[PDB]
């Protein structure tokens, strides 16, 4: 049986770790909710 626990407030934090790239991808979404790449 599942249960929930509070993990924090939802706020924007100034001076957070800035990381991660911005890739433009050609994708497809199937009936099961699965994303896949189209090439």
């Amino acid at each position: 049986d599942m249960y929930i626990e509070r993990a924090g407030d939802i706020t924007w934090e100034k001076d957070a770790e800035v990381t991660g790239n911005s890739p433009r991808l050609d994708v497809a979404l199937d009936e099961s909710g699965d994303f896949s790449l189209v090439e």
């Binding site: 509070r6 924090g8 706020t11 770790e17 800035v18």
Partner: protein
Amino acid sequence: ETTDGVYRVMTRRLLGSTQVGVGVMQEGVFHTMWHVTKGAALRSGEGRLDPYWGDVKQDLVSYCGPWKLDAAWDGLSEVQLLAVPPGERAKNIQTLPGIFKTKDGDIGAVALDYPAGTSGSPILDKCGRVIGLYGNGVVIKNGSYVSAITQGKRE
């Protein structure tokens, strides 16, 4: 506990307490990804949260009421993933989203890799508004993981 904020979704079905995902509590409605709970009921102390709406294609589910989150990525600015990893404290990560181009339109995407149990963590704009949830994405030719910015529809 119905206080607004970010929550861990846990299970005692496996060895110890295992974190299967994360969710957002807003306006008395709990929002998470469908693959975290599979539509199952949730416990919050003595209280029970029953599912209200869900969709396997969108990979979203809401508890106690209809989907409340309606803010969207502006397609220009950086965003923050408030990542809640298993066994670790909540952490904000700022990134500029990429794009998923589909036959039905473009969707924002965040190129951050985190454990499976981080699914449902909220993505926020500079005002702290939840513009979507992390956890439904794809694995690119790099081997890395890129998640869509998944947002529901508020009626």
